[PDB]
Swiss-Prot record:
Keywords, comma-separated and alphabetical: Glycosyltransferase, Signal, Transferase
Biological role stated in the UniProt entry: Alpha-transglucosylase that specifically transfers single glucosyl units from alpha(1->4)-glucans to the non-reducing terminal 4-OH of glucose and alpha(1->4)- and alpha(1->6)-linked glucosyl residues. Acts on amylose, amylopectin, glycogen and maltooligosaccharides, with the highest activity with maltotriose as a donor, and also accepts maltose. Does not act as a hydrolase: weak hydrolysis activity is only observed on the disaccharide maltose.
InterPro entries: DUF5110, Gal_mutarotase_sf_dom, Glyco_hydro_31_C, Glyco_hydro_31_N_dom, Glyco_hydro_31_TIM, Glyco_hydro_b, Glycoside_hydrolase_SF
Organism: Cellvibrio japonicus (strain Ueda107) (Pseudomonas fluorescens subsp. cellulosa)
Protein name (Swiss-Prot/TrEMBL): Oligosaccharide 4-alpha-D-glucosyltransferase
Annotated active site: 375, 378, 443
Membrane spanning residue stretches: none
Record-level Gene Ontology MF annotations: carbohydrate binding; hydrolase activity, hydrolyzing O-glycosyl compounds; oligosaccharide 4-alpha-D-glucosyltransferase activity
Chain's gene name: agd31B
Signal among keywords: yes
Similarity annotation: Belongs to the glycosyl hydrolase 31 family.
Length: 780
């Protein structure tokens, strides 16, 4: 039994007092509200919020039975007796408290009938998680396949078909019950920690995500090289083996940006060395030379680190001496029995642990390390009586990796202010994207089921802030012999997901360069294609930095008024223009693609398909996976390079997919130096835009560039524009008023400026795209 007693305004925040205590309401933006219960008391601070202290000016009005606290779009409606807060966008009800806050920590809300609920981060349960209950405790799920209620990276958040996001801003061991125990109740629970939630609203899913990342944090543009080809396994045993692998990429003609070094870099066994955090010199005798030799070939080195320091490690005594480790309640270093041996955990929440760990990263980064892999940050083992500077293990658990990322991010920005940090980690929290976290989906089994789950996992993480979620390509765990077909399918899909990082236990090769001739003949052109497509991918990355928009988008974005599409986890958008349907079983001979209505082209074959709703059946082959291009797409390409260190857009090739059904279309290509963390803030970029206007007798392109450019930007780019499904009735072309005849023969065999290929229905234009505006007009 809870009821309103009184309220005060204090610094734009509403402080309500009930019989049970104080409640602080602060708008963190016009569409986002933080609700803090037990506001009177000492609590852990917010982890989810980018600006925890902020509170924007809202309006307050009072009635007999209710209070109303409003920003721009979002309104909190506070019923006085019994006490219950509900949330409105306009006057549409988003979410209503049931009993609300109780005692343990517990929050209870009503779910509306038919409401679909995404969220929880990494689970394999179906896209709509309504009807499920699961814990909020980051934890390993080694060898998972087609099911999981609990994995490496849970998020205490949900997204609803009402277009709100709800965050439980609490770091502790907890649980979420999404209308499972009681049909119409969403319940959030924790053992301890902060008693706060955050509601974010939007008018569309893109706007919701923009609003969410506004208040939780925007991912800073990663270095372009993170969009490249990684060489990885668990693990290279020696400097000789790592060098032989870089070489294998060069001798096999596969692109390679980065090689990743797993735990053998600091010791010859899996057990007993963790915490050494220094080179095993018997096996890596000349590591500075190794890294410099790789950097000459345009190849970066990334090293694994973990939170644990073993008692058998060279750094135990020093970490104890420095007070860097978490303690027991008695005050001494907490040691416990990991797989690797008896050891402690670095306390990234303390000043002393942060300084000791940071100094180690600094030293290795000085030696030549370009990037960092933080594994086991769940933490993988985290006994409940472990004490951190700000709380016990069970209170801080789900924020350990998040703070570990923050610590490493700040450290890398301090050491290399002119570089973009690369931080790859397994476990975080809501907002960890603001520290550049690039998550992967853990120790997936080498099964079709493991592959068939990756889209669900990726979309779930993308929707709640994590654009660079990806999988270990080809699979990680167990197996005795390569499953060739599954491997190929997984590396094909790889091209159309955020990070191209095949990785697996080393009794079976993860790297495509160690595969048989047929496998390499299939994958080599695809890995190159990933490089040729860098302007498409880097431009989606740019939009993710700008607005939260994930790189992988779900089918349901295509029609916001058809909630049944939410269930789809087999087809997704890669950027604006490509609808990808990975093949996730052996021997599949054809697929049915639930393409949204409109006109679509086969990416590989150029076939045009029109549909008014019905799915398209495409045949499959072993050399590709089904990809459709949306009519009105501009697909930009550059020539393939071996490494992004050689990236140039001096030569562009742009493919436009024309159809009269699309009378206006736009595209954009974002170019900058690929490395400057301040490029966007300072406008040190070249932003190419393209607009097509398609009427009955004309097809008009307007091309332009904005931004202040950057050092080494080409002034003039040689541009080949290829118009697919181009009319055969275009007689002339004007480029900026200068008329050019369209050749109708020998397009492939003359240096033609404009040429129509009648057999392929393609019209090719070749021109110079300089700093001034350009108009290309085709007319019948
Ligand atoms: C952590 C990662 O999930 C996996 O990709 C690594 O290859 C391995 C080895 O460092 C880690 O798992 S574990 O074996 O240490 O548990
Ligand atoms: O649609 C057109 O413009 C045509 O195909 O002739």
């Amino acid at each position: 039994a809870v009821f309103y007693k009184e309220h005060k305004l204090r610094n734009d925040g509403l402080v309500i007092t009930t019989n049970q205590g104080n409640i602080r309401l602060q708008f963190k933006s016009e569409a986002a509200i933080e609700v803090l219960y037990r506001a009177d008391s000492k609590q852990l601070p917010s982890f989810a919020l980018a600006q925890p202290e902020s509170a924007i000016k809202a309006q307050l009005t009072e009635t007999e039975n209710h209070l109303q606290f409003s920003g721009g779009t979002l309104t909190a409606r506070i019923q006085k007796r019994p006490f219950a807060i509900s949330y409105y966008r306009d006057s549409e009800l988003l979410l209503a408290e049931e009993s609300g806050f109780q005692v343990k920590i517990n929050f209870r809300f009503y779910l509306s009938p038919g409401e679909k609920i995404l969220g929880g981060g990494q689970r394999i349960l179906g896209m709509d998680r309504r009807g499920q209950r699961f814990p909020l405790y980051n934890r390993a799920h080694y060898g998972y396949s087609d099911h999981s209620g609990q994995m490496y990276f849970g998020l205490p958040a949900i997204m609803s078909s009402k277009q709100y996001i709800l965050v439980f801003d609490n770091s502790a061991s907890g649980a979420m019950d999404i209308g499972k125990t009681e049909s119409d109740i969403l319940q959030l629970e924790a053992k301890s920690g902060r008693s706060a939630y955050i509601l974010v609203a939007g008018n569309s899913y893109p706007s919701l995500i923009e609003n969410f990342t506004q208040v939780t944090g925007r991912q800073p543009l990663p270095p372009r090289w993170a969009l490249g080809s990684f060489a990885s396994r668990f693990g290279y045993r020696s400097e000789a083996e790592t060098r032989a692998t870089v070489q294998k990429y060069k001798t096999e003609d596969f692109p390679l940006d980065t090689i990743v070094l797993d735990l053998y870099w600091f010791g010859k066994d899996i057990k007993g060395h963790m915490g050494n955090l220094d080179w095993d010199k018997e096996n890596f005798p000349t590591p500075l030379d190794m890294m410099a030799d790789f950097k000459q070939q345009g190849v970066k080195t990334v090293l694994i680190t973990e939170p644990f320091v073993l008692t058998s490690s060279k750094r135990w005594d020093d970490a104890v001496k420095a007070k860097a480790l978490a303690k027991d309640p008695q005050g001494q270093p907490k040691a416990f029995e990991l797989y690797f041996g008896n050891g402690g955990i670095i306390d990234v929440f303390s000043k002393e642990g942060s300084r000791w760990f940071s100094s180690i990263y600094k030293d290795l980064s000085k030696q030549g390390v370009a990037g960092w892999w933080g594994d086991l940050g769940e933490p993988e083992m985290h006994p409940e009586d472990t004490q951190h500077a700000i709380g016990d293990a069970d209170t801080v658990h789900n924020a350990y990796g998040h703070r570990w990322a923050e610590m490493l991010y700040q450290q890398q920005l301090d050491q290399f202010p002119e570089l973009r940090p690369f931080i790859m980690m397994r476990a975080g929290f809501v907002g960890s994207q603001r520290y550049g976290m690039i998550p992967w989906t853990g120790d997936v089994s080498r099964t079709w089921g493991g592959l068939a789950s990756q889209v669900e996992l990726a979309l779930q993480m993308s929707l709640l802030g994590f654009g660079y979620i990806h999988s270990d390509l080809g699979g990680f765990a167990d197996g005795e012999t390569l499953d060739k077909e599954m491997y190929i399918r997984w590396l094909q899909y790889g091209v159309f997901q955020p990070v191209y990082r095949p990785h697996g236990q080393d009794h079976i090769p993860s790297e495509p360069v160690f595969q048989d001739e047929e496998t390499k003949a299939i994958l080599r052109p695809l890995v190159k294609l990933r490089y040729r497509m860098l302007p498409y991918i880097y431009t989606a990355a740019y939009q993710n930095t700008l607005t939260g928009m994930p790189l992988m988008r779900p089918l349901f974005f295509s029609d916001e008024k058809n909630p049944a599409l939410i269930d789809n986890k087999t087809s997704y958008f890669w950027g604006d223009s490509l609808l990808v349907t990975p093949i996730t079983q052996a021997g599949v001979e054809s697929v049915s693609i639930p393409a949204p209505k409109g006109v679509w082209f086969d990416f590989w074959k150029d076939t045009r398909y029109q549909t008014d709703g019905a799915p398209l059946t495409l045949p499959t082959d072993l050399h590709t996976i089904p990809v459709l291009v949306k009519a009105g797409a501009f697909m930009p390409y550059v020539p393939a390079v071996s490494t992004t260190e050689d990236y140039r857009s001096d030569s562009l090739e742009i493919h436009y997919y024309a159809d009269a059904s699309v009378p206006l279309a736009q595209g954009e290509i974002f170019e900058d130096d690929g490395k400057d963390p301040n490029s966007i803030k300072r406008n040190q970029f070249d932003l190419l835009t393209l607009q097509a206007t398609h009427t009955d007798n004309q097809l008009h392109f307007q091309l332009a560039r904005t931004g202040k450019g950057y050092r080494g930007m080409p002034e003039r780019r040689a541009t080949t524009l290829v118009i697919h499904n181009a009319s055969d009735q275009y007689q002339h072309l004007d480029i900026n008023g200068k008329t050019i005849a369209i050749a109708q023969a020998d397009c492939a065999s003359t240096p033609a400026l404009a040429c129509y290929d009648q057999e392929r229905r393609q019209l090719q234009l070749v021109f110079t795209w300089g700093r001034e505006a350009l108009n290309l007009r085709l007319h019948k």
